[PDB]
Design a protein around this ligand. Structure first.
Ligand SMILES: NC(=O)c1ccc[n+]([C@@H]2O[C@H](COP(=O)([O-])OP(=O)(O)OC[C@H]3O[C@@H](n4cnc5c(N)ncnc54)[C@H](OP(=O)(O)O)[C@@H]3O)[C@@H](O)[C@H]2O)c1
Ligand SMILES: NC(=O)c1ccc[n+]([C@@H]2O[C@H](COP(=O)([O-])OP(=O)(O)OC[C@H]3O[C@@H](n4cnc5c(N)ncnc54)[C@H](OP(=O)(O)O)[C@@H]3O)[C@@H](O)[C@H]2O)c1
Ligand SMILES: NC(=O)c1ccc[n+]([C@@H]2O[C@H](COP(=O)([O-])OP(=O)(O)OC[C@H]3O[C@@H](n4cnc5c(N)ncnc54)[C@H](OP(=O)(O)O)[C@@H]3O)[C@@H](O)[C@H]2O)c1
Ligand SMILES: NC(=O)c1ccc[n+]([C@@H]2O[C@H](COP(=O)([O-])OP(=O)(O)OC[C@H]3O[C@@H](n4cnc5c(N)ncnc54)[C@H](OP(=O)(O)O)[C@@H]3O)[C@@H](O)[C@H]2O)c1
Lengths: 249, 249, 249, 249
């Protein structure tokens, strides 16, 4: 089908839990061979889950905070395999008023959210250019469009990956590489645990989401498959928000 | 299926040619019963094509420039059927320097591009609210985001339908009606024949499109099906550009 | 100075009260001769206020709901005077759930908010093109970017004037006519009386505005003068939001 | 005066040439005491120009590529003065296809364009919060909104500073610190010399600019003064494009 990922090989970062894990499973169900990339061996679980369900997968363990090491691993893979799809999902958020953010903490967020996404995009994207086709989907955020509260480095980094998306689409679309972003709204995962623990804040958020409910990681799967599939072949340099109407509120 | 329209009934306006015709066909292939709505009997041919192609379709003939008439037809269809999906595709464009635009010509563009989309959205949308479920997809444009040249009324109308998309999503998402837009880039259709008449203007446009080619109507089908399907159930109030990277250039 | 409007003649619509009245006064203080355009004779008051303060002004009474009449008046003026600046401020908002909006009420909002702005822009803009310079500033809205609640026609119309702004800037910037928009956030005026009367809604809004306070009409003056002045001579087709940070929240 | 900077102290980075130099001068003319911050002693010349031009200015020499050093300098200046305005203008650009971009070159761009703006904003901003008042204006770019060509790191960095602008505005507006950005279009400066080296590339750009001309650094001054003045006191979290209509084309 036009929505099929049969015959593709997809790398999905931060595949150990949350949105990444759901996308890894979803891609496998869609027919892709999945490289689940994670920071710890716990991603081997996911690879096993996929296998035990009839799917095709394997684990990659490499800490994206280590850019040099990440680049080595990605280049190895890009050369060793025909990777058709990259999903830049790994990300971290640090909540603290701007005045209190140390340079170290600012850089830590930017390293994983932006720099690593760049390193992987460059590595796998360069091989995609050589094969005449590929897709790269980066997980963005509501904070790719808005400032939020107490997450300045996060907001900067999430705006940044949208710039990276547009730049790479501009340069690479004509050579068969489709680069886009998927911006989740408010999703029930570990990254929002502290947020949801604040009853008042969580109620404020919920009241504002037009759909009236937070997302599950599964809500991100349909759109992630779409963006990696033939069905999105003329879609380039876009950010598709999956946010229950948040950006319209 | 996550991307299936099996069991749905869809109304597609401007279904007689170009983008609407392609969407009508694609929706039928995805399992929808299609009500092909057009201004002339030409749309009966489309329903017939879909028919002996193995699909399910009927034709609706009604001039969207007649809003009172359009409302009557939409309301009756909404009351005698269960219409799950509406695609607002009918649109016209008038090219002329803004200084030369008569009020009548301004009005003619807004009536079809904006007012008619409103009347149909209100009519089918009201019934969707009662059924607890539905999707509305409006065909926007690059000129929903930029000014272009010699198309002031068109740009105004295409920004306006994005505003409408956002307003209805904000109001209706929480009641199960998913309202979104699809913004085509430059597409080979009767609507751009006058534009492409000038080979130099055409090539100038192509040079600017990152993908290096104009779209065909078929390029709009995958995204149109996605936005009407279960895979997009948390997508609300969004404008998905299908534009070969234009907006990123 | 670069921020001076000395020697200019400015038309300001909806100048009888609120944002328009404050802009009329502000422009006069900046040195412009002001044509205060209103729906009723109450705008003669404003013209008198300006005069009694040492400024230069006069009243224009013409109901913008009457497009034909508006066009006659604007064309008369455009030919009779050297109008350097037009501020399209007149506007109406009608709050009601979308399902309940009649076609008549939809059209009423679009007529004043969009059609009239177009008629005046075309009339005065055409004369500006002939004189080799001019500015047009249209009052937009937060609902030029977002859907809001219970104001679908308003949102459509306010998105639309942003399209009109971009289109006219695209066509006319090179011939000396600077066309831009000013998008107010939440302002204490008659148009928000019903909103502010709802204690809970008003508190919701206030909590969301980062600056922590609603705007006064006076908050719009500095930006309106800026956009009409030599200081903004390379600013074209932009929407400057004056919103206390609303769009960043 | 609504547009006066009389009695203010302003720090302008990259003040040695181009846009920064022009802003330094314009701020001085508007009555500000200017701290012209540059990487080399060249900026002492600027302070001297301002001086015998009748203005008030000092020079600060500090390489923004050295973030630990930049932080020390900014913190000391913030503690020993009352700095009312910060203009983050220092920026660099590196042109090269993304496939050819080394991690070091990527980092060099982000360090100056993003990280340094962060360090200074945090340093001066913290003191502004304590004084209950301040303005921060960051120089963004067209590539804060589009991908451009052969400038992936630059586009990422310029989107990022918009994210930062929005985050700080969201957090700080309610405490009297107005944080905004100014996005120049194509400007005749050393930063675009390599671009303009090719007369055909230059003319191609000009053809696309609605205003029909590239900007000069002086085109940025009026908007820069506006954003730092009382006239913009309700403007928060905004990016004002000064681009001859580029973004509308
Ligand atoms: N949840 C939301 O509402 C929301 C909204 C907007 C955007 N997003 C984005 O969506 C993405 C998915 O995250 P999530 O929501 O699903 O939260 P999550 O599952 O709880 O955590 C995200 C994943 O990133 C991984 N990761 C972090 N640093 C890594 C590193 N240096 N190397 C390799 N992997 C690393 C985590 O693995 P480890 O735990 O082992 O470190 C984890 O698997 C993130 O980029 C996030 O920013 C989420
Ligand atoms: N082509 C592009 O590059 C582009 C870009 C952005 C958006 N769009 C939009 O895509 C949509 C489809 O246009 P198209 O490109 O596919 O060209 P098209 O082949 O001419 O499609 C437009 C259709 O609208 C129908 N229509 C016009 N007025 C009508 C009315 N009063 N009542 C009922 N139907 C009416 C036309 O039917 P009749 O032939 O009988 O009049 C025609 O079938 C439009 O909204 C258009 O604005 C196109
Ligand atoms: N207040 C906000 O928060 C906000 C936010 C976004 C945008 N805006 C826009 O800012 C603009 C200013 O309005 P406002 O806030 O200052 O409210 P307002 O002063 O209470 O009312 C606006 C003005 O529009 C005039 N007007 C309406 N219809 C007219 C017509 N057919 N012909 C001539 N004049 C007409 C009104 O005059 P009459 O009363 O005599 O009819 C009135 O003077 C509006 O376009 C509004 O949409 C306001
Ligand atoms: N020109 C355009 O079309 C355009 C468009 C959008 C944005 N911008 C932005 O406008 C700003 C100004 O650039 P410009 O156009 O005026 O060209 P410019 O004349 O080269 O200005 C850039 C300045 O940044 C300074 N700088 C670079 N690295 C520095 C460092 N590590 N520490 C301290 N200062 C440093 C440079 O000083 P040195 O000479 O000593 O290195 C230079 O004076 C930049 O942010 C730029 O990205 C320009």
């Amino acid at each position: 089908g036009p929505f099929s990922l049969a015959g593709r090989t997809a790398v999905v970062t931060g595949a150990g839990s949350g949105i990444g894990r759901a996308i890894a499973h979803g891609y496998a169900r869609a027919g892709a061979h999945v490289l689940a990339w994670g920071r710890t061996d716990g991603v081997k679980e996911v690879a096993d889950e996929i296998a035990d369900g009839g799917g095709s997968a394997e684990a990659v363990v490499a800490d994206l905070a280590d850019l040099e090491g990440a680049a080595n691993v990605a280049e190895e893979l890009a050369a060793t395999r025909r990777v058709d799809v990259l999903v830049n999902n790994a990300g971290i958020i640090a909540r603290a008023p701007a005045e209190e953010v140390s340079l170290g903490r600012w850089r830590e967020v930017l390293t994983v959210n932006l720099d690593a996404a760049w390193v992987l995009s460059r590595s796998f994207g360069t091989a995609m250019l050589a094969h005449g086709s590929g897709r790269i989907v980066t997980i963005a955020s509501m904070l790719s469009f808005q400032g939020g509260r107490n997450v300045a480095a996060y907001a900067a980094s999430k705006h940044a990956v949208v710039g990276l998306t547009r730049a790479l689409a501009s340069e690479w679309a004509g050579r068969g590489v489709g680069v886009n972003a998927l911006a989740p709204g408010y999703v029930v995962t570990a990254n929002t645990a502290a947020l949801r623990a604040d009853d008042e804040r969580a109620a404020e958020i919920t009241a504002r989401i037009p759909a009236g409910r937070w997302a599950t990681p599964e809500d991100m799967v349909g759109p992630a498959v779409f963006l990696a599939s033939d069905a999105a072949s003329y879609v380039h340099g876009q950010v598709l928000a999956v946010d229950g109407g948040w950006l319209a509120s």
